[PDB]
Amino acid sequence: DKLKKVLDKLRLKRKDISEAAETVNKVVERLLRRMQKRESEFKGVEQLNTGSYYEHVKISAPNEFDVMFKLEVPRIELQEYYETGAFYLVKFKRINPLSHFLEGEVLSATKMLSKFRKIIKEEVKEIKDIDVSVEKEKPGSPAVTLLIRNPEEISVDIILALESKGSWPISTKEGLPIQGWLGTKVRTNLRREPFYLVPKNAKDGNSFQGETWRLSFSHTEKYILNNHGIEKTCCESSGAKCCRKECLKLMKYLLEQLKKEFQELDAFCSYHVKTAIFHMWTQDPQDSQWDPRNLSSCFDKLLAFFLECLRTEKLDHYFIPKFNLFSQELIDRKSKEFLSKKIEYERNNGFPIFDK
Amino acid sequence: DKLKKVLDKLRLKRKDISEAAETVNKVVERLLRRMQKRESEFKGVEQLNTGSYYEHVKISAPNEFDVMFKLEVPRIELQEYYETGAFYLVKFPLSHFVLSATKMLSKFRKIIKEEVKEIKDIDVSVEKEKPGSPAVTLLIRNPEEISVDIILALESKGSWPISTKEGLPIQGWLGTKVRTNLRREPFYLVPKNAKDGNSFQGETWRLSFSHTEKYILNNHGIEKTCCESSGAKCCRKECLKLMKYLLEQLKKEFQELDAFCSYHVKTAIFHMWTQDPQDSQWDPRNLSSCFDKLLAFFLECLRTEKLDHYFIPKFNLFSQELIDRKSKEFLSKKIEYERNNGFPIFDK
DNA sequence: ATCTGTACATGTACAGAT
DNA sequence: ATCTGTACATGTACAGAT
DNA sequence: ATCTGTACATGTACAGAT
DNA sequence: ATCTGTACATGTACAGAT
Ligand SMILES: Nc1ncnc2c1ncn2[C@@H]1O[C@H](COP(=O)(O)OP(=O)(O)OP(=O)(O)O)[C@@H](O)[C@H]1O
Ligand SMILES: Nc1ncnc2c1ncn2[C@@H]1O[C@H](COP(=O)(O)OP(=O)(O)OP(=O)(O)O)[C@@H](O)[C@H]1O
Ligand SMILES: [Mg+2]
Ligand SMILES: [Mg+2]
Ligand SMILES: [Mg+2]
Ligand SMILES: [Mg+2]
Ligand SMILES: [Zn+2]
Ligand SMILES: [Zn+2]
């Protein structure tokens, strides 16, 4: 009941979806078409809508869209970067419109992202119908972010991605553990889909900095979000409704509210809660473990699970098991103890942050 | 335990599967290769394996294989034949065939026939054509006898025809997303090769959904994991095998059952699987009651003379126009008999 | 004259609105 | 409960290219 | 266009554990 | 008797090479 009302608050409004989507699709079209022009390195790039808005778990407002401009790259070989599972050098065998980004067979991420970014910056300059500018580049981000003032503020991450169609990299052989949940035929079909490499683009100052790419599975997560039940009719017009997405929304909101108040939580992001709930959906595969009348209990066990990840400093990438998003190398003890105490306080005092 | 023992008897042998398949595949690849690699009107024909062997519900022996040679044909107009549901006239290479199903089948049949004659490493002949069949049937003697039905089909890539709009009622079983996706697949037209002497009979084709039935047979649970290595086993296919066996044994003994075929059984269990979508209703421990309610459903179809085509609902497969009332009453007494005496027929 | 990338045309699950 | 806008998959038409 | 190579589904088969 | 784990076999989807 309390949580039913929070969900009502988080529910997007069709009126807002219309206005935001009409603007967003205009810009994204125009950008996509410029990538196709003339002697552009990005000709043939294709569009893939990803993230919460397209999974129907975007909350509060339709004010952040994520879009992938993906480029298929044939005849590619990878060098895993220092056994991290998730980061790769991209190498070319033949000796090519990406030639300007080559650094002797090695494909530079930051060179490629700069050119991409330069092109985007130029196209929005020439947009005069709507109020749109290009955010100052954020370190670690694979994206060129647009700020649209639709009056209302809207962010769009244009994510640049390489598309390889070969089999997924060895480091993912043991990830995506959906066999007892969505099953083996689904797993096989998903792993026949391409995989994607986005620029890591860190500024830490370590070797291969600007030639390191990160694996991306936004497309797989989108499929899973919209096909999330052991039963094929889960959440369908002739099936039973579950509370899996509603639990994701509530946890997303807990993090947003908290992250909005306390800058100690800067190391945390929603992909952390998205990853945690993929594990919970694997742990509890049955649709009856997500009955809408047990929303309280399902949300409480998701919190219990997240707390245990924070305390044990272990939250494995759903697709790359050896990659721990909560390692001390990425988020230190005190950042995690701080969020642990904040969650545990909301848990045990009526979730007062839901009323802000 | 009775029925468990029968299903052991009906189980194909890995050795038999290997020898039949390697001989079948040899023939089919060669016919398929002639269809294109020789300047013929079927140059774009592609192979699609269908039926019980490829759905893993073949029983007793691997001795009957069904193959579809499908041909993409664009911008066809369909016209429904006297509101039959399932039979259509086709209008607009193939110029030398209103696209007459008979005329096209015959050249197709002529091509296979010539090719079979030039096969010298397999004992294979072409069966005499049956009025009623969309098929060119090969008889292979690998010592063991094996039938192959080579089924000519047109492939249309538009919306399924109106008569199916109410068909495929999987919504509460496999769901609306599977139904939508299946209906994005192409649909197929095979020759209605009757002899009845009725009106447009030579130019009529029939809708085929073997490709859709294959997916359903191999994706049959309400849970995605049904019958997978990390899921539970269900006894859905086992019931199909048991009901197919009962019919096969009955037909073998009674000439009165000539009008019945396995497709009747297949259609009935599709309705049952829709009626009882829950995987727990097809629990392996309950194989007996599951089979018995299949029997009871099939007898209710006979009693009421009503067994609608699972994809074309106004097409009654048990209409008087197709199976006489006497034939259905005969099958009813025989099934009721087996049912109430522990299936004596399963021992012979 | 035919060929074909681009974009319209069609249909429907998802979920908000009434 | 029904009505309805957006997203998305797939089929097709045609201006502009060959 | 046409074909092999790859990966894993669907099976059968049998021994050791239950 | 059934269950589990490994071996053994064919079918099928699709990437990539020619
Ligand atoms: N750190 C990350 N590692 C891997 N993939 C990530 C990471 N951050 C984001 N992504 C991918 O990019 C998508 C979009 O990122 P974003 O941060 O907008 O989150 P979201 O899932 O869209 O949710 P929201 O935008 O509502 O906070 C994610 O859904 C995920 O697929
Ligand atoms: N009367 C029919 N109407 C529509 N499709 C049919 C009909 N008869 C057969 N088919 C199609 O052709 C396939 C092969 O037919 P066939 O008679 O070989 O049966 P089957 O399903 O292969 O089983 P079995 O051969 O073991 O009896 C069927 O599964 C179905 O897809
Ligand atoms: Mg987002
Ligand atoms: Mg983002
Ligand atoms: Mg068969
Ligand atoms: Mg047959
Ligand atoms: Zn659900
Ligand atoms: Zn099953």
Author numbering:
A (entry chain A): 148 to 242, 246 to 506
B (entry chain C): 148 to 239, 247 to 251, 256 to 506
Describing publication, verbatim:
Next, to determine whether Mn2+ is preferred at either metal binding site, we soaked WT-mcGAScat•dsDNA crystals with ATP pre-complexed with increasing concentrations of Mn2+ (0.015-1 mM) in the presence of excess Mg2+ (10 mM); the presence of Mn2+ was tracked via its anomalous signal at 1.8961 Å (6539 eV) during data collection. G The presence of Mn2+ at each indicated concentration for the ATP-bound WT-mcGAScat•dsDNA crystal was monitored by tracking its anomalous signal (contoured at 5σ; the average resolution of maps shown: 2.63 ± 0.11 Å). Here, we found that cGAS specifically favors Mn2+ over Mg2+ by ≥100-fold at the catalytic metal binding site; the binding here also cooperatively increased the affinity for Mn2+ at the first site. Our structures consistently suggest that only one Mg2+ is necessary for productive substrate binding, while the second Mg2+ drives chemistry (i.e., neutralizing negative charges upon deprotonating 2′- or 3′-OH by Asp307). When ATP is bound to mcGAScat•dsDNA at Site-1, its 2′-OH makes H-bonds with Glu371 and Ser368, while the 3′-OH interacts with Lys424 and its own β-phosphate, apparently stabilizing the substrate.
Cyclic GMP-AMP (cGAMP) synthase (cGAS) is essential for the host defense against cytosolic double-stranded (ds)DNA arising from various maladies (e.g., pathogen invasion, ionizing irradiation, and genotoxic chemicals). Upon directly binding to and dimerizing on dsDNA, cGAS cyclizes ATP and GTP into 2′−5′/3′−5′-linked cGAMP, a unique metazoan second messenger for initiating type-I interferon (IFN-I)-mediated inflammatory responses. cGAS is central to antitumor immunity, host defense against an array of pathogens, and regulating autoimmunity. Here, we resolve these numerous fundamental mechanistic questions in innate immunology and present a unifying catalytic mechanism of cGAS. Finally, we reveal how mouse cGAS achieves more stringent substrate selectivity and higher catalytic efficiency than the human enzyme. Together, we set forth a unifying catalytic mechanism of cGAS in which dsDNA-binding pre-organizes the active site into a rigid yet adaptable lock for two sets of keys (substrates and intermediate) necessary to specifically synthesize 2′−5/3′−5′-cGAMP.
